């Protein structure tokens, strides 16, 4: 079907997140979430490799013009030259309903066109 809207949110960094060595210990990145609109927006934070990542908040409702920091952190591993990792991370959002009497409700009567998502890319540099 046809997606109701584009994504609404503002992200920074928009296209790549990256990940600098060296990787001995948990390096973290942040992902802010901007909401330009006048409308509530609840998001979801979505991953390829969640047993690498932990990332707080991994979901929450941004206020008209509010602005929220998603720390991303990358666990510790040890370089292995035969691994080909391409991570991505996805924001997925909605708008909330006027109406709608609590967060839960937003996603469990959504509909595939009104969720807009937005893509990633993990980029490790030693």
Same mark, same amino acid.
Request: with cysteine.
């Given at each position: ?7 609404? &949110?503002? =992200?920074?960094? +928009? $296209? #790549?997140? %990256? ?11 942040? &992902?802010? =979430?901007?909401? +330009? $609109? #006048?409308? %509530? ?17 991994? $979901? ?67």
């Amino acid at each position: 079907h046809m997606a109701k809207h584009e994504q609404i &949110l503002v =992200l920074d960094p +928009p $296209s #790549d997140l %990256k990940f600098k060595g060296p990787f001995t210990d948990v390096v973290t990145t942040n &992902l802010k =979430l901007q909401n +330009p $609109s #006048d409308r %509530k927006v609840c998001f979801k934070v979505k991953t390829t490799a969640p047993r690498r990542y932990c990332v707080r908040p991994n $979901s929450g409702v941004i206020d008209p013009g509010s602005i929220v920091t998603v720390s991303v952190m990358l666990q510790p591993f040890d370089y292995d030259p035969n691994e080909k990792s391409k991570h991505k991370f996805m924001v997925q959002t909605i708008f909330a309903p006027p109406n709608i009497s609590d967060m839960e409700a937003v996603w469990k009567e959504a509909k595939p066109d009104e969720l807009m998502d937005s893509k990633l890319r993990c980029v490790f540099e030693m």
